[PDB]
Design an enzyme around this catalytic site. Structure first.
Site, mmCIF file in Angstrom:
data_model
loop_
_atom_site.group_PDB
_atom_site.id
_atom_site.type_symbol
_atom_site.label_atom_id
_atom_site.label_comp_id
_atom_site.label_asym_id
_atom_site.label_seq_id
_atom_site.Cartn_x
_atom_site.Cartn_y
_atom_site.Cartn_z
ATOM 1 N N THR A 168 -22.295 8.292 -26.620
ATOM 2 C CA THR A 168 -21.335 8.539 -27.683
ATOM 3 C C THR A 168 -21.386 10.032 -28.030
ATOM 4 O OG1 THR A 168 -20.648 7.717 -29.803
ATOM 5 C CG2 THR A 168 -23.023 8.106 -29.552
ATOM 6 N N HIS B 211 -28.019 -0.355 -34.188
ATOM 7 C CA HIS B 211 -26.929 0.278 -33.502
ATOM 8 C C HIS B 211 -27.279 0.698 -32.079
ATOM 9 C CE1 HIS B 211 -23.194 2.493 -33.067
ATOM 10 N NE2 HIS B 211 -23.912 3.561 -33.058
ATOM 11 N N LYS B 212 -28.454 1.252 -31.835
ATOM 12 C CA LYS B 212 -28.825 1.693 -30.487
ATOM 13 C C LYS B 212 -29.546 0.574 -29.747
ATOM 14 C CE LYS B 212 -27.532 5.985 -30.698
ATOM 15 N NZ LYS B 212 -26.188 6.374 -30.342
ATOM 16 N N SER C 133 -20.725 3.045 -28.633
ATOM 17 C CA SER C 133 -20.121 3.617 -29.829
ATOM 18 C C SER C 133 -18.819 4.389 -29.549
ATOM 19 C CB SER C 133 -21.266 4.421 -30.451
ATOM 20 O OG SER C 133 -20.774 5.282 -31.461
HETATM 21 N N1 LIG Z 1 -23.732 9.023 -33.193
HETATM 22 C C1 LIG Z 1 -22.687 8.072 -33.445
HETATM 23 C C2 LIG Z 1 -21.450 8.484 -32.685
HETATM 24 C C3 LIG Z 1 -20.327 8.322 -33.671
HETATM 25 C C4 LIG Z 1 -20.269 9.053 -34.838
HETATM 26 N N2 LIG Z 1 -19.213 8.607 -35.479
HETATM 27 C C5 LIG Z 1 -18.583 7.654 -34.816
HETATM 28 N N3 LIG Z 1 -19.264 7.487 -33.691
HETATM 29 C C6 LIG Z 1 -23.237 6.744 -32.979
HETATM 30 O O1 LIG Z 1 -24.252 6.658 -32.275
HETATM 31 O O2 LIG Z 1 -22.621 5.808 -33.443
#
Ligand SMILES: N[C@@H](Cc1c[nH]c[nH+]1)C(=O)O
Ligand SMILES: N[C@@H](Cc1c[nH]c[nH+]1)C(=O)O
Lengths: 256, 256
Positions: free
Chosen positions: A10, A234-235, A79
């Site tokens: 992302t 999220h990750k 993402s």
């Molecule tokens: N760093 C964000 C990338 C993103 C920022 N805003 C939207 N997408 C993520 O890992 O989600």
């Protein structure tokens, strides 16, 4: 089967977020490419030289152009990686066996390319300590961003170890969503992006791409397959790496 | 006591090799700076724009210049990080409480600055799949290098996990030892570099800075303190992170 996975990071990240998943997939016999997109990872360009999400996607497009007639890849995006997949499938849908969306935006073919991103900003409007700056490229004022460290800790890397979070603090770079250029961009086509098999992977534990947003996306443009990983954050390629490798083994076995 | 540690990576690496040690030291209450040196990590310069090890060391020198009169730091350098410490201590010996050498080169004040590096090339002459290129900067032909992946796996990251090794494959950049410029460089001074307390940390399991080289360095220029970590490999901050944090807690307690 064995597949060739192309892993797409992302914004503000680089190939390095895949450092845990890439060894695993290869250990299962798959080929894995993990690209730095323009002005990302250790790519030498700065974000001010990039004028659009299409310019941003150049390492992926050039990669897909280099593949010999007849071989196919499974694109895996995380993402905002979903938008790079829409741009690449409009130009190389013949080279794509399937695209996996991993806690990702899922653009459609009915609304402007910025639609899903405008809906993320409504569901998630407080970006904590993220900073912004503007720059001009090809007569357009773009808003760049640099992810705040408290946003990285709490919302994106919630459940990741302190050493994984450290890599995010050390390696995240200035990026841009190029939202205003995305709006005026022509729509993703039905015969290109619309024809790709889309597998949607997500967790309800995601703290930025909240369940409301993610279930909203599923209803707006139905994926071919949906997988929900329990737990994680999220990750998922960092907190649930084995589970994502299993899902990707099963996607390789079904699509080519 | 609590100290301010400034962690200095070796060539072709970046601040990211410290992603495991930095959280640990901070968890013990220390302040930690982990710098990218020029054309390293996500620093925007390319190695072709750098003409010497002194130019390479610019982020560290500028960092030390920015510290307010009266505060002191413990410099911790790994592998070629020892030369950045010699350059910085010749200009800011008043800002350095101690320098820790971590499987590092230990320059002296008696022989040209390239001496220890010439001795490493005699003990370690086969660099496996490492590639070289030359470029010209300020009328000098420099030999740059890009570390080979089999050399990274076998000699530098021997015992590190596949995901740590993955980060090395993804993030190592083109560097240079600037060996020919180091030779003609003026010697490190006795009143600058010679006056710094030097703590030498090493393992006999190191596969590139072999025991013959490391024990040779200890005899050539006696360190104030020597610590030998049992086990590990070349990247002790990755394979023996806790042990290095303990040694660094003990260095903070003794020097200021
Ligand atoms: N760093 C964000 C990338 C993103 C920022 N805003 C939207 N997408 C993520 O890992 O989600
Ligand atoms: N990557 C090397 C740096 C170096 C290469 N050659 C000499 N020193 C290391 O970690 O040891």
């Amino acid at each position: 089967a064995f597949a060739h996975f192309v892993l797409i990071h992302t914004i503000c990240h680089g190939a390095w977020i895949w450092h845990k998943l890439k060894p695993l997939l290869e250990a299962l016999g798959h080929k894995v490419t993990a690209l730095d997109l323009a002005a990302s990872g250790v790519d030498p360009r700065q974000i001010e030289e990039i004028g659009s999400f299409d310019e941003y996607s150049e390492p992926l497009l050039t990669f897909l152009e280099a593949l010999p007639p007849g071989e196919k890849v499974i694109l895996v995006g995380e993402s905002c990686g979903g938008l790079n997949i829409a741009i690449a499938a409009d130009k190389y849908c013949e080279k794509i066996a399937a695209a996996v969306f991993h806690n990702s935006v899922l653009p459609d073919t009915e609304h402007c390319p910025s639609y899903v991103v405008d809906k993320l900003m409504e569901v998630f409007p407080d970006w904590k300590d993220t900073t912004y700056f503007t720059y001009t490229k090809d007569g357009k004022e773009i808003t760049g961003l640099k992810l705040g460290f408290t946003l990285l800790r709490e919302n994106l890397y919630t459940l990741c170890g302190p050493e994984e979070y450290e890599l995010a603090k050390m390696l995240t770079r200035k990026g841009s969503l190029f939202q205003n250029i995305l709006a005026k961009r022509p729509f993703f086509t039905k015969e290109g992006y619309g024809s790709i098999k889309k597998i949607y992977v997500w967790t309800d534990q995601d703290e930025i791409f909240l369940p409301e947003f993610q279930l909203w996306q599923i209803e707006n443009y139905k994926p071919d397959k949906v997988y929900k990983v329990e737990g994680g954050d999220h990750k998922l390629q960092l907190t649930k790496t084995k589970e994502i490798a299993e899902i990707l083994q099963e996607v390789a076995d079904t699509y080519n």
